[PDB]
Amino acid sequence: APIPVIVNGAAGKMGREVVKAIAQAPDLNLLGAIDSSPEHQGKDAGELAGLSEPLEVPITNQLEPMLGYVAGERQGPPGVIVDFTHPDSVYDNVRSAIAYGIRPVVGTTGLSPAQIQNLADFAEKASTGCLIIPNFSIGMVLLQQAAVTASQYFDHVEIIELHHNQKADAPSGTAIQTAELLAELGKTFNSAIVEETEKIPGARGSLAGEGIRIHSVRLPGLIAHQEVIFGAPGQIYTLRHDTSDRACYMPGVLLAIRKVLQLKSLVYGLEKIL
Ligand SMILES: [Mg+2]
């Protein structure tokens, strides 16, 4: 009895992909594809995202009809909506799904902490599960969980993060998220056993909460990589995540879709279901 899944933002880039992966997944069944683009309207969702025989689903553009349709007891699992929609509409699409009882799986792009607070409230009151997901890559999130665990027994830790050299911001978003997570415990790391001298400014990286250091490397040849290094006497423990090309959200997306069924309220971060 596979899961019935709506994909909002269906004709979009990540959207097209997710449609593809749901087709390949037997325990997941696409009931409906939605997009704003008038140019993509009639087409079949499967065919459109590039595969062989077209499914039986056209790329319509009205949400509630499809929601109501889904929340009509299928006899199988509760229904899921995966959103990949422009920032404008994300809050309202999500809220609209929650209202109908349909579980949202959606990234944080387009959503402010205050809005998430509000969606949290709608979900608790609705007792409808919802996943807000800052990072979709499994490896990153296992790394994050593993680091959080380890931080309770190690007092010393540094983060090294390496990206392609076209990348403007430093440190990256993810290295900082990872630092917040570690620092949420209210434990201070890296307490000095010596007064340091910076012979050259910048050598020790940036300071990011509860004494944690982040170092940022930029070179061509890299894509996205992150390494967390925990130290103790006689001992080093290193968690690394490397990205090979930028289409590895998928297992996370599908994992979100499966795991949200277990939820009666909103959860921030995938590292919490895992
Ligand atoms: Mg980033």
3-state secondary structure of 8: strand
| DSSP secondary structure letter of residue 60 | -
The answer to whether the annotation marks 42 as part of a ligand binding site is no
Give the separation between CA 134 and CA 119, rounded to whole angstroms. 15
> Which residue, 24, 18, 250, 241, is CA-closest to 139?
241
Give the separation between CA 113 and CA 80, rounded to whole angstroms. 23
The whole-angstrom distance between residue 127's C-alpha and the CA centroid of its chain comes to: 22
The answer to whether the annotation marks 107 as part of a ligand binding site is yes
Read off the tokens for 202. 């910048």
Give the separation between CA 34 and CA 37, rounded to whole angstroms. 9
Helical packing angle, 63-71 and 87-99, nearest 10°: 30
Cite the DSSP H helix spans in the chain: 13-24, 45-48, 63-71, 87-99, 113-126, 138-151, 173-183, 250-260
The answer to whether the annotation marks 178 as part of a ligand binding site is no
**Ligand 1 midpoint to CA 216 (Å):** 12
Read off the tokens for 36. 């704003």
The experimental method behind these coordinates is: X-ray
The answer to whether the annotation marks 72 as part of a ligand binding site is no
Torsion angle of C-alpha atoms 78, 83, 87, 93, degrees rounded to 10:
-30
- How many other C-beta atoms can be found within 10 angstroms of the C-beta atom of residue 247? 11
**Ligand 1 midpoint to CA 204 (Å):** 21
Query: Per the omega criterion (within 30 degrees of 0), is the bond before 87 cis?
Result: no
Up-side HSE of residue 219: CA atoms within 13 Å toward CB?
6
**What's the angle, vertex CA 208, arms to CA 218 and CA 106, rounded to 5?**
75
Q: Which residues are catalytic?
A: 163, 167
Read off the tokens for 92. 């309202």
**Ligand 1 midpoint to CA 11 (Å):** 24
Give the separation between CA 240 and CA 169, rounded to whole angstroms. 21
In Å, what resolution does this model reach?
Answer: 2.8
**Ligand 1 midpoint to CA 28 (Å):** 29
Give the separation between CA 209 and CA 182, rounded to whole angstroms. 9
